[PDB]
Ligand binder design. Sequence first.
Ligand SMILES: *[C@@H]1O[C@H](CO)[C@@H](O[C@@H]2O[C@H](CO)[C@@H](O)[C@H](O)[C@H]2NC(C)=O)[C@H](O)[C@H]1NC(C)=O
Ligand code: NAG
Ligand code: CU
Ligand code: CU
Ligand code: CU
Length: 495
Amino acid sequence: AVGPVTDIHIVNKDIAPDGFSRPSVLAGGTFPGPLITGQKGDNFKLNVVDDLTDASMLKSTSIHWHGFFQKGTNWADGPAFVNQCPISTGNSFLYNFQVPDQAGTYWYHSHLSTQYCDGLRGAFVVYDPTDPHKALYDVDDESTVITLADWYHTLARQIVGVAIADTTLINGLGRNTNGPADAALAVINVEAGKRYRLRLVSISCDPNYVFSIDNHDFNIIEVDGVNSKPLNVDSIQIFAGQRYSAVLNANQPVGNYWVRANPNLGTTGFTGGINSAILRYKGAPVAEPTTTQTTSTKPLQEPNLRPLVSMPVPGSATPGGVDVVHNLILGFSAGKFTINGAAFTPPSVPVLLQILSGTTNAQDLLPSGSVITLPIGKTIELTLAAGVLGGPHPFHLHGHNFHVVRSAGQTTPNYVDPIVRDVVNTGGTGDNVTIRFTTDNPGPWFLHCHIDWHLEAGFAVVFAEGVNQTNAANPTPADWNNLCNIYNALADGDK
Ligand SMILES: *[C@@H]1O[C@H](CO)[C@@H](O[C@@H]2O[C@H](CO)[C@@H](O)[C@H](O)[C@H]2NC(C)=O)[C@H](O)[C@H]1NC(C)=O
Ligand SMILES: *[C@@H]1O[C@H](CO)[C@@H](O)[C@H](O)[C@H]1NC(C)=O
Ligand SMILES: [Cu+2]
Ligand SMILES: [Cu+2]
Ligand SMILES: [Cu+2]
């Protein structure tokens, strides 16, 4: 692991995580990138050094630290042309932020176009020295982090039509249905009688995964950074960018057990050991499991998740019982995804810079139709009624957690004790996923589908939260101040 203070080099490397070699964009020269760690209350100083030379995956870059509120450091959030201009090749940029009030399981990824699909993604764990759940497990370290990733044989910018993941990678390793069958599988090591905090991280660009481990079950204790009441489950559907801590008791006979991550698209199932990794008990033979996937009798359902500590729902217990309601219309037309009829396209001047430079009138913010101002200090309700093609769409809000007052597949809202998280499945026809939060964080924040192909195709809006408090809230460093000057000076071939 690295952090809280570290350089992170962004490099090109040809890799073959399923036996198929291709160019990639990697943090620290590995897929996934290095695990970043720190403690609650740390000042993260993450010096991102852009060493990229391959124009086919972009030489520029920008990194988002997924799930962190970035209060007072909106400039460090990552989204290109919302919060910064990209870092240019041969340059560095220091992401300098604090995490005073968060601890849990997070991740990081490129937030420039579809570049994270080309490899720039990794896990990020913030430990809590007084974690209320600490006595529920024995082992919690780099070896208990499990990343689930989609992998494409075609470069992101060379995809024609609808992207379909070729291979599921667990901790960077996996077999392709038409690939070498001797391609290495990831191994998760346990010892009989010990309990493990499995930090399950979706670093997916698109598919959701149904995660299970043969003959084992879990207690979920954390959801997207938020401590939960322990919830006993035996399978976990995890959407793009979601995280869970799932405590596993190594209470089965010493042996090898299949770890399964079944995608919703591409090649499904487990023939030849695809979509699989290995849980190996100390003392077991070094071999593939022979175990059977038994029926999930207690699958995770989002409405069953409850915050560990009381987190009252903002507003009153009825639809629209808040200061500000936006019933967002999620659609698709003219070859692009739309929110309230508008497809997001990045502006030349980052939204934050527009505001800081003096553009504080809602009507003047660019891109026109894709920026919604929110007043500061107010309760907000968003609905995200589903049905639009390409689903199920997992929506993500930057700068915030939110209460999921109505989940996909849930008819009646819960205004008492719904889970709080940062990525939510919006479901399908008939669903009307509803989320609430309070505007306590001045700055422009993305709301978008975390299927990265859909973001690129316009499925996003920017919430310009507390526009007239944004300058005061977010003093910017000299290196941020110069990013657009450097980037705009680049030749087209060096972007
Ligand atoms: C999703 O739920 C919201 C309520 O939370 C619905 O919004 C209501 O829509 C009706 C019909 O247009 C309006 O008369 C109400 O004023 C709206 N209520 C609020 C509180 O804003 C919305 O229609 C639902 N969407 C779908 C597709 O069913
Ligand atoms: C910010 O304040 C200015 C000056 O009062 C006003 O014209 C503008 O509408 C405000 N912007 C927002 C987004 O509230
Ligand atoms: Cu993310
Ligand atoms: Cu995010
Ligand atoms: Cu989507």
